[PDB]
Design a protein around this ligand. Structure first.
Ligand code: ATP
Lengths: 260, 297, 12
């Protein structure tokens, strides 16, 4: 379809950058006041916000990247965590969207917990801390590349892979342990296997150097997350992916075994 | 935070802000300072600036303008660039009557293609290539500048902003409202600039979108489904469009030789998914004798 | 708006 002239160059570049743009894996243990559970509540809320404003999934993924990098070097009290998230979503929207919501919308969606002044000051601080390095690789960026290797393309597989990649955003333990390209790999394989019974294609071993064996640790975690998704405290991604835009893929029954 | 800069002169202003020539009081380094007022729209740091800064930090290359600093200071945000002598438009206008020697045109085009290929290989679309946004120095270098309209693209692309590229340099897939565009748009612009270096006049100086399209069609023929599959089903394609014959391509930029005309034809190919890439263009025989001449400024 | 404003609550 699209001529693939720069596809390999870009893949290579993204593989370099995902290592550099990675947050610090154990950062939460050094936060005195916030926890992984609080982070999950924040990300789940950002899912809702993205739905309300009809934002791209990419924008959500970027915001999560910004948040984890910010919290990797800045101690934050629980009463300011939503401020960090809101400024992150604002910045992601400005980067990624054709029409980002205005700042007043970001204030509104917090029930006026913070002022416009506060959101704009936090924006400045997030930019400072991230040294304006906002063009981060995401799980979504790898997924869209992987989808070009379907035989043939399947809307349900794409939507289900997107769902699983998104679920990974919620749970810092375990998902901070894995790179975006690895989670995307596990998500794609699990989606393919669930919908069509197909597996990670040989063409993607060629492209990425990853095999089912190399993806296995992440795939085992993601399979458990998928199995347990209806019981998770956070449900916004499941609800989102029940809708027709996503072919109701969160209503599909997960495979009980992967036969690895 | 701006104490160490002495403003020397205002060199530009627009809705975006203001650009000064300035000098570092301590080191003597000459810079271009782009000042953004933050108290003007009160939506915080503008998207354009967020994109320009984030993407330039990933675009360190000899043919891309260097971003030296960012000073995000109260009600203002300053981007500090390296300073280059002048832009390509000013250079061409100064050469309106003598023209630009072919070795320099060739060197410039080769350099522009190097910088553009680097952008594209780093998933950046420039989307405002025009002579005013290309900067030259006294030593023979040319650099891509003015990344405020740039964006990081994905593989494959999604639909992006439709209001892109200055009219005279805007690709036909944009004019015809295609759902998707990508790197080919920048190659189209660069083809137009190549032509303009040879003539010192814009190749397609339209005054409306339909005047722009009809100009293109008169120069390259009205495209049909054979030359560009899908063209007649594009959102802003209209069945009423006159169907101009395709003239001999040698007439497009008469001074171009066989190799120059070959490369330009590939840059101005209608179907974006067959238009030459910057990468591929580097291997074109037109550059077999490329050198780095110094401009006459 | 469908989604109303919400102040997030972070209990222990
Ligand atoms: N890094 C730089 N070094 C030196 N001069 C620069 C640099 N960046 C921009 N300039 C100059 O600043 C001026 C900017 O002018 P302005 O923004 O008003 O519009 P323009 O770039 O001249 O034209 P257009 O509106 O077509 O882009 C130009 O004269 C340009 O040559």
């Amino acid at each position: 379809n699209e001529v693939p002239d720069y596809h390999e160059d870009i893949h290579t570049y993204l593989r370099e950058m995902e290592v550099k743009c990675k947050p610090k894996v154990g950062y939460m243990k050094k936060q005195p006041d916030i926890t992984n559970s609080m982070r999950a509540i924040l990300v789940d809320w950002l899912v809702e916000v993205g739905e309300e404003y009809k934002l791209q999934n990419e924008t959500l993924h970027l915001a999560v990247n910004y948040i984890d990098r910010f919290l990797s070097s800045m101690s934050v009290l629980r009463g300011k965590l939503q401020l960090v998230g809101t400024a992150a979503m604002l910045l992601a929207s400005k980067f990624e969207e054709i029409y980002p919501p205005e700042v007043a919308e970001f204030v509104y969606i917090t029930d006026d917990t913070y002022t416009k002044k506060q959101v704009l000051r936090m924006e400045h601080l997030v930019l400072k801390v991230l040294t304006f390095d906002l063009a981060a690789p995401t799980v979504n960026q790898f997924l869209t590349q992987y989808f070009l290797h379907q035989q043939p393309a399947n809307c349900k597989v794409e939507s289900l892979a997107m769902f699983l990649g998104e679920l990974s955003l919620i749970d810092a333990d375990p998902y901070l342990k894995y790179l975006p390209s690895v989670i995307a790999g596990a998500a794609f394989h699990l989606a393919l296997y669930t919908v069509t019974g197909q597996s990670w294609p040989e063409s993607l071993i060629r492209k990425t150097g990853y095999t089912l064996e190399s993806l296995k640790p992440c795939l085992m975690d993601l399979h458990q997350t998928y199995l347990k998704a209806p019981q998770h405290a956070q449900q916004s991604i499941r609800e989102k992916y029940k809708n027709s835009k996503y072919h109701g893929v969160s209503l599909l029954n997960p495979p009980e075994t992967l036969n690895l | 935070s701006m104490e160490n800069f002495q403003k020397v002169e205002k060199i530009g202003e627009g809705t975006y802000g203001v650009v000064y020539k300035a000098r570092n009081k301590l080191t003597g380094e000459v810079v271009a300072l782009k000042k953004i007022r933050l108290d003007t729209e009160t939506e915080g740091v503008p998207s354009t600036a967020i994109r320009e800064i984030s993407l330039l930090k990933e675009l360190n290359h000899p043919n891309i303008v260097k971003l030296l600093d960012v000073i995000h200071t109260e009600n203002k945000l300053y981007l500090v660039f390296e300073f280059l002598h002048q832009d390509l438009k000013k250079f061409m206008d100064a050469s309106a009557l003598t023209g630009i020697p072919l070795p320099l045109i060739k060197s410039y085009l080769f350099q522009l293609l190097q910088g553009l290929a680097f952008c594209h290989s780093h998933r950046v679309l420039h989307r405002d290539l025009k002579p005013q946004n290309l900067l030259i120095n006294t030593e023979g270098a040319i650099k891509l500048a003015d990344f405020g309209l740039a964006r990081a693209f994905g593989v494959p692309v999604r639909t992006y902003t439709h209001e892109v590229v200055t009219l005279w340099y805007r690709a036909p897939e944009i004019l015809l409202g295609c759902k998707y565009y990508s790197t080919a748009v920048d190659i189209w612009s660069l083809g137009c600039i190549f032509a303009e270096m040879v003539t010192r006049r814009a190749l397609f100086p339209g005054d409306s979108e339909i005047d722009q399209l009809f100009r293109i069609f008169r120069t390259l023929g009205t495209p049909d489904e054979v030359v560009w599959p899908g063209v007649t089903s594009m959102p802003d394609y209209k069945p009423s469009f006159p169907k101009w014959a395709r003239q001999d391509f040698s007439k497009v930029v008469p001074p171009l030789d066989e190799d120059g005309r070959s490369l330009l034809s590939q840059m101005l190919h209608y179907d974006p998914n067959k238009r030459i890439s910057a990468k591929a263009a580097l291997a074109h025989p037109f550059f077999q004798d490329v050198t780095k001449p110094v401009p006459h400024l | 708006h469908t989604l109303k404003g919400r102040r997030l609550v972070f209990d222990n």
